[PDB]
Amino acid sequence: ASKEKREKLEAYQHLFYLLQTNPTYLAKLIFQMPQNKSTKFMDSVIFTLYNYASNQREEYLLLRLFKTALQEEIKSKVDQIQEIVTGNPTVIKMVVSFNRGARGQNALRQILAPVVKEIMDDKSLNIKTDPVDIYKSWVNQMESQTGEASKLPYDVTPEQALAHEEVKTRLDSSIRNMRAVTDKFLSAIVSSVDKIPYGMRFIAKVLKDSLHEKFPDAGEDELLKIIGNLLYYRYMNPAIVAPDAFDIIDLSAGGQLTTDQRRNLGSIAKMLQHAASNKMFLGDNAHLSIINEYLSQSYQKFRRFFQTACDVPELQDKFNVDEYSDLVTLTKPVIYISIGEIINTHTLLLDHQDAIAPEHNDPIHELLDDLGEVPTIES
C-alpha cells in the first residue's frame, strides 16, 4: 500500500538522475518544444530537475545541457543567423532566464548598480537630445518665468527649432552630457567582464564557436555582434531599463522610479544598444552626428569586450574535474520535486520518448516502462 508510493518515487529519482547525467535526453526534449515568446514552462521543467543548480555538481551538469542544447539548436534550427536576434532561440532565452536567479542577479548589480545609482541620484540630469523638445521646454520655461504666453509658436520643426541660439546651446550641452553618461555605463560594463557569471560567458563561447562552424563565411564582426545580443542586449539592457524589477537597486517598500529616472535610463539603454551593434542614428538628424561618431568609437570597445567575454576555460577546467568521480560529494543526489512537477515531466518524456531516446535499447526505455502510468494528482 504505502511501499508502492515510495518505490515509485525512488524510481523517479533514479530516472531524474539519468536525465541529469546524460544531457542528450533533455537537450532533445527541449528541441521538441514550441517556439514561444516565453520559456516559463520548459524552464520550470528543466531547472527543477537540477534543483536550480543548488551545488557545483548540478551547476556543472546544467551547463553541459545548455552547451549540448545550444549546439544542437544552432546546427538544426538557425538557418541564416540573425534569427538569434530576431526570433525566439529557445536555448538562448533559457540561459538568460536562468541567469535571472541569485547568481546572475548578483552579477548584474555588481556591474550596473554604481552607474544606475548615479543616474537615479542626479536630479539635474539633462541628456535631452531632441531639438524640438528642447525648444518646447525652453518656451514653457520662459512662460512660467515671465507669466505671459510666449509669442513663439508651440509647434515648430526641428530645423526651425535649431534656429534659436538658446536651443542650439542647450542641445550642445545636452549632447555632451548624453555622451559622458553613456561613457560611464560603457566603461563600467567593459571593465567588468570578470563579473559576468562564468555560465553566461561560457555559453557565449559556445555560441560563437557553434555559429562560426555553421557560417564559416560569417565575419568575425557579424559574429561578435551576435554575442553582444546575448551579453548586452538580452542580459543587461532590460535591467538598465528597469533596475528595480531586476534587483539592480533596492527601492523603499513602496517606492518606484520617477518618470524622469525611467526616461533617462531608457535613453542610456538606447545609446548602449546602438553602440553594441554599431547602429547609427539615421533620419534627418545631422545634429546627432557627434553622437554617431561616439557610437562608432564605442562599438570598438564593445567589440573587444564581447571577444574577451568568450575567452573562458572549458567546462572541465573551470570546475576542476577529471572524471565525474568528482563533484559527487553530495553522497546520495536528491532532486526536490512535487507530484505536480513529476506528472508534467513524466508526461513529456512519454510524448517524446522516441525522439529523446532514438535507440531501441536505450536504458531510459526500461525505466519509463516499469515506471508505467503517469500518476494522478493524488496517487
Side-chain angles (χ1 to χ4, degrees), residues 5-73:
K5 186 93 170 188
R6 233 293 142 159
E7 300 183 65
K8 202 170 175 176
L9 283 184
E10 293 177 11
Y12 275 126
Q13 289 290 300
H14 183 63
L15 172 64
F16 296 158
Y17 185 68
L18 179 69
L19 299 184
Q20 290 186 347
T21 51
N22 301 71
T24 297
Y25 301 123
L26 294 177
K28 303 280 179 47
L29 180 68
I30 292 164
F31 200 83
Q32 312 299 297
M33 295 308 124
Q35 301 295 301
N36 288 302
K37 300 180 181 178
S38 173
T39 62
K40 171 71 177 304
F41 182 63
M42 280 303 281
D43 279 11
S44 63
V45 171
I46 304 301
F47 297 172
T48 288
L49 296 178
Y50 295 77
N51 290 309
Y52 282 77
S54 63
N55 60 47
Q56 195 171 61
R57 196 190 126 255
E58 305 169 327
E59 191 179 333
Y60 174 79
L61 296 175
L62 185 58
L63 289 168
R64 279 196 63 200
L65 172 51
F66 288 164
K67 178 179 176 183
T68 311
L70 213 213
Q71 273 172 169
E72 183 52 50
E73 185 167 49

Side-chain angles (χ1 to χ4, degrees), residues 281-292:
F281 283 98
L282 304 177
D284 193 9
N285 307 294
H287 51 281
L288 261 26
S289 56
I290 305 70
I291 299 287
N292 284 331

Side-chain angles (χ1 to χ4, degrees), residues 85 204 207 222-236 276-277 302 305-307 310:
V85 183
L207 184 62
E222 172 178 42
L223 292 193
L224 287 182
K225 281 187 183 176
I226 298 299
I227 272 47
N229 176 65
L230 171 66
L231 296 180
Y232 176 71
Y233 195 62
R234 281 169 188 285
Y235 182 48
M236 307 186 194
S277 54
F302 255 144
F305 170 73
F306 300 151
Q307 191 169 298
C310 299

Side-chain angles (χ1 to χ4, degrees), residues 189-198 200-205 208 220 223-224 227-228 231 299-303 305-313:
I189 295 177
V190 172
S191 64
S192 301
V193 204
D194 296 304
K195 293 177 183 176
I196 297 164
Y198 170 70
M200 181 64 73
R201 296 182 62 179
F202 172 64
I203 288 302
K205 182 178 181 60
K208 187 166 169 291
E220 174 69 351
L223 292 193
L224 287 182
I227 272 47
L231 296 180
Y299 175 55
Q300 296 305 303
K301 296 179 185 174
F302 255 144
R303 238 196 73 170
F305 170 73
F306 300 151
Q307 191 169 298
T308 306
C310 299
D311 192 1
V312 159

